[PDB]
Structure 1
Amino acid sequence: AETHGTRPDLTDQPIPDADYTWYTDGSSFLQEGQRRAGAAVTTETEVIWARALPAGTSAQRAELIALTQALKMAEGKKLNVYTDSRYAFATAHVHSEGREIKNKNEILALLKALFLPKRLSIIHCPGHQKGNSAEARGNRMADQAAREAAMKAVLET
Structure 2
Amino acid sequence: AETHGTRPDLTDQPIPDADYTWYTDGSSFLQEGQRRAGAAVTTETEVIWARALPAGTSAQRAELIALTQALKMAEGKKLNVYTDSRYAFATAHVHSEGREIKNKNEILALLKALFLPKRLSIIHCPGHQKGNSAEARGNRMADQAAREAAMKAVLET
Shared fold, TM over 0.5:
yes
Deviations 1:7-33 (A, max 9, x none): 000000000000000000000000010
Gaps of 5+ in 1: none
Deviations 1:32-59 (A, max 9, x none): 1000000000000000000000000000
Partner Cα distance (2:5, 2:47) in 1: 30
Q: TM-score, normalised by structure 1?
A: 1.00
Deviations 1:112-132 (A, max 9, x none): 000000000000000000000
Shift of 1:80: 0.0
Deviations 1:87-123 (A, max 9, x none): 0000000000010000000000000000000000000
Shift of 1:78: 0.1
Partner Cα distance (2:52, 2:140) in 1: 17
Shift of 1:75: 0.1
SS of match in other structure, 1:21:
strand
Aligned partner of 1:10 in structure 2 is 10
Gaps of 5+ in 2: none
Q: TM-score, normalised by structure 2?
A: 1.00
Partner Cα distance (1:96, 1:127) in 2: 26
Q: Give the share of equivalent positions with the same residue, in percent.
A: 100
Deviant stretches of 4+, over 4 Å: none
Partner Cα distance (2:139, 2:14) in 1: 15
Partner Cα distance (1:45, 1:78) in 2: 20
Partner Cα distance (2:16, 2:138) in 1: 18
Partner Cα distance (2:131, 2:17) in 1: 25
Partner Cα distance (2:155, 2:98) in 1: 39
Partner Cα distance (1:131, 1:98) in 2: 40
Shift of 1:141: 0.2
The CA RMSD over aligned residues, in Å, is 0.2
